[PDB]
Design a protein around this ligand. Structure first.
Ligand SMILES: *[C@@H]1O[C@H](CO)[C@@H](O[C@@H]2O[C@H](CO)[C@@H](O)[C@H](O)[C@H]2NC(C)=O)[C@H](O)[C@H]1NC(C)=O
Ligand SMILES: *[C@@H]1O[C@H](CO)[C@@H](O[C@@H]2O[C@H](CO)[C@@H](O)[C@H](O)[C@H]2NC(C)=O)[C@H](O)[C@H]1NC(C)=O
Ligand SMILES: *[C@@H]1O[C@H](CO)[C@@H](O[C@@H]2O[C@H](CO)[C@@H](O)[C@H](O)[C@H]2NC(C)=O)[C@H](O)[C@H]1NC(C)=O
Ligand SMILES: *[C@@H]1O[C@H](CO)[C@@H](O[C@@H]2O[C@H](CO)[C@@H](O)[C@H](O)[C@H]2NC(C)=O)[C@H](O)[C@H]1NC(C)=O
Ligand SMILES: *[C@@H]1O[C@H](CO)[C@@H](O)[C@H](O)[C@H]1NC(C)=O
Lengths: 49, 109
């Protein structure tokens, strides 16, 4: 939408949780589990491929 | 709100014009400009409680902390009407110490 403006990635993930109706404390208080789940989900794609 | 469906930027409004066998759309959009960099933090710890912005981000100009809206820089001081509380400050990665100002009790002298 213009020039790239940097933001830390967990803070971008919190904006995106807001965009679906969940408060952002739910992301910050679960950060490690959410990242573990994303990593297992990405590791399952290359296994199916 | 569909990205790039009505031009580049944040769609404000669009005007139609007729062409021969066709149509022309003049899209008016909003494009952000002249950014500055800041230090930032996800929450703020005060009295053993974690504070999150209601809307906006916590930013630091070098020595002081403010809340701003995310798309236009307009800094304000962090109060209990700017933020909400959840939990204690032991669980959030990158939490920062600052004071969150209450209006009522300095009204009550
Ligand atoms: C929410 O669901 C997750 C499942 O992804 C739970 O986390 C797992 O809990 C089991 C316990 O049975 C552990 O063995 C796993 O190692 C956990 N997974 C990860 C990625 O940490 C989590 O406990 C659930 N939360 C609640 C409150 O029920
Ligand atoms: C960050 O902004 C603050 C403004 O709040 C500057 O601090 C001073 O703060 C006092 C009381 O809050 C004001 O009376 C002053 O007018 C403010 N400015 C000055 C120049 O004294 C602070 O200087 C700013 N810091 C940086 C690094 O820009
Ligand atoms: C951002 O990354 C920096 C590393 O570049 C982290 O700084 C380190 O913090 C640890 C404490 O967890 C210290 O032991 C290291 O000495 C620091 N390294 C440097 C180079 O400063 C910083 O903590 C990270 N920020 C967050 C919020 O995790
Ligand atoms: C932010 O403020 C809290 C509140 O005091 C600090 O917590 C103290 O941390 C030190 C060192 O980690 C401990 O020795 C104290 O026992 C803690 N106090 C309490 C009341 O728990 C915290 O360290 C501060 N954060 C930073 C980065 O300085
Ligand atoms: C912000 O700082 C970075 C270096 O950390 C620099 O590359 C960038 O151009 C700066 N942008 C602005 C708007 O100051």
């Amino acid at each position: 939408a213009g020039a790239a403006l940097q933001i830390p990635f967990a803070m971008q993930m919190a904006y995106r949780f807001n965009g679906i109706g969940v408060t952002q404390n739910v992301l910050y208080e679960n950060q490690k589990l959410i990242a573990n789940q994303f990593n297992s989900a990405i590791g399952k794609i290359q296994d199916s491929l | 709100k569909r990205v790039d469906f009505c031009g580049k930027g944040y769609h404000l409004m669009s005007f139609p014009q007729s062409a021969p066998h066709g149509v022309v759309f003049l899209h008016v959009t909003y494009v952000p400009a002249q950014e500055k960099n800041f230090t930032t933090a996800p929450a703020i710890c005060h009295d053993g409680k974690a504070h999150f912005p209601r809307e906006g981000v916590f930013v630091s100009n070098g020595t002081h902390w403010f809340v701003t809206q995310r798309n236009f820089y307009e800094p304000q001081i962090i109060t209990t009407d700017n933020t909400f509380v959840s939990g204690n400050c032991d669980v959030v990665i990158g939490i920062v110490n600052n004071t969150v100002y209450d209006p009522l009790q300095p009204e009550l002298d």
